Design goal:
Helix 8 runs parallel beside helix 9. This protein folds into four domains: about 210 residues, no CATH class; about 400 residues, no CATH class; about 50 residues, no CATH class; about 150 residues, no CATH class. Strands 33-32-30-27-23-22-21-35-34 form a nine-stranded parallel sheet. Strands 2-3-4-5-20-17-16-13 form an eight-stranded antiparallel sheet. With about 800 residues, the protein is α+β, with helices and mostly antiparallel strands.
Amino acid sequence: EQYLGNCTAYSVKGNKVVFSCANNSKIMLQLCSGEVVKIWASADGNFVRNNESFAVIEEDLGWKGNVTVKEEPSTYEIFTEQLRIRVNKAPFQLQIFDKYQKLLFSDYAEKGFVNDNGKIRTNKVLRNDEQFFGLGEKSGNLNRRGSAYKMWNSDQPCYGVNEDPLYKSIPFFMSSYRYGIFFDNTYKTEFKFGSESNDYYSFEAPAGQMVYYFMFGNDYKEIIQNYIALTGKPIMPPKWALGFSQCRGDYTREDQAREIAAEFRKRKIPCDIIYQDIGWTEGLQDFDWRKNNYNNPKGMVKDLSDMGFKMIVSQDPVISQANQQQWKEADALGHLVKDVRTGKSYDMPWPWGGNCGVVDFTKPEVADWWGSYQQKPLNDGVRGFWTDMGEPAWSNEDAVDRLNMKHHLGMHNEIHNVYGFTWDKVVTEQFYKHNPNKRIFQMTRAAYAGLQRYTFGWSGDSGNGSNVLDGWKQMANQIPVGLSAGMGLIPFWTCDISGYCGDIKDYDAMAELYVRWLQFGVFTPLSRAHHEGGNAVEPWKFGTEAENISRKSIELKYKLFPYLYTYAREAHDTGLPIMRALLLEYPNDKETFKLNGQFLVGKELLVAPVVEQGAVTKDVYLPEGEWIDFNNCKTKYKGEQWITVDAPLNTIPVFVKKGSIIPQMPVMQYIDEKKVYPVTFDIFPGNLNKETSFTFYEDDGESRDYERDVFCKTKITSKASNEEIKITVGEREYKGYSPAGPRNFILKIHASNKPKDVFAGGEKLKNVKPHVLEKNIEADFTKINWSWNEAENVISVRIPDSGKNAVITIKN
């Protein structure tokens, strides 16, 4: 095996510096910014790759001028505003320090880069206290330290608590030394975080080029901000995707869709999306409504639309050979992935429907051809897709015959991990082309880094296949799976609520597991109940107790829509997921590295779902600050401690941080049932003289105008003085979108005693009954008054949403 060995010279080309080492080997450092370094180590010195990055869309992160290299007798030095780089000459070693000269990131001994006949590997120093997070949608504990992980998009139904690899390959991790690494290689890469030795960690690939990005940050937020500068801002879903969604394996018929749609509304269980699974299409993959299953598909979609249901249909990336018309069409056009042994279309077995052709989404001409096929259901009013089976399915590591697949852009060993990615990209591209100025809804199984530009994600076929009732630990593991997905830029994520796997032979026995899975599930952004085959898992299937609890779980998400949607926008602007590992907000608190049973939803809410069978309590770590029980709004706790709370079957432990302002909307059966509504702001005043705020974001929810920053915002500010509370409703920041109006705001200030008086600017406000304040809340927009509720300990202040600045002063 070959190392870089000694560095004999360097050459600068603008922001790039190339260090020449032994036997024609070279390594390039490229300054993208003061915080982001692109590193390319080359065994032969050539600096070429078969395909440019599928993930990186921008290498220019603001670096100005040339790289300045200072040469010393035994080292070179490169400085940025944030970094100090020491290159050892003999042998070549790259060391990156922060500006205070603390080592962040070092090559291990002489083994910084190792080439062995195309196998490429990088070894780094591993400090004893160094922890690791990320690598996308993967199982096990949040903290990756001590374990090994592989990138090979795999199809592992009913996967275990530690199963790896899974469906997606996002080779982006973060270190507790406050750097991220994105390994810009699409082959079967492996990450070993002290699993081989305590002295070093490594990442490697069996072929391709050793290109990776070092991303410094002063916290995890800044690392993620740098990652989306490289790989793109997340697209936001249509606003209605943040409601509740329902599916089943057999959701493939008009009659059943009509039946289910009516049942949801009758039982007053909110729901925005009815999915259809893959049996909807006449064959793989013609996008024709299966004729026996749908009498009037246009009418179905419209009828469901008038009831506030949107439809999302499945697509697979293959054409069945038995679908003779489409297979012959695709094969004759050369649109199918080839077999290198024959030069003919690869002959792919598939879970159902016979052998198939794998459609080659790396071939440019395929995009327009697929686009026209997929547009058919969209012309009937279907709003999007779920792109399933794109690993491709049935192509795990051990299925070595798949390696004979030859795609337009390369061989399967290179292309496998971007197969689904390049498909999903075509799906979204074509959607844009045929459906002007509309947000796509796409939720995918298989993916690669950068997927946030084109698609959202779900965690595939989870749960226990042998006995559904044994899936508790598998459900529990969806917390860190989803949090890790979020850190790999899947802010719009869900899991199969109830899991995919396991026949439900006893609904009474399943009720507890379902309820808990859903209580967790409604705090995932794309919350979708689903299950294999005919196993119905709509929220009324588990008896009346489970139905009433589940309705409330779902109602809670809907009430929080204006809060969740604000954080959906933040995902777009910053890359931060809605579901946040506590470490993302409390990076100094090392206790957060262990937390697999809880998470933040945005910054203000801490959710700690019960995920243990029979449990009627929950252990909760509270980080810095003070925390209020969001269910009662009265119990308060000090931060930086473990507590145990009561958590019966009807309860989700949710906590709100003291200081928080939470926008909420009234209960509705689907997003935008009421086109205009009063917005409530639940305010929990922070400590004496500590200012806090929430910036309530709004936009049209449907178009791509938001990408050009067409929106509005209303900042609500809270600041407590000596015996006084100042609540400011900021002047509306108008950027080309006007909110729904006219409407009222109701400021709800949680306080222990009724105040003496409340002022709006200079003038005193009239105190009225709770019933008087609630009167004509949706009809009269001239009343400015306040009321008190002793039971709830809440001051309500009704004020019209005029768009004007307003200072509300509460005299204690």
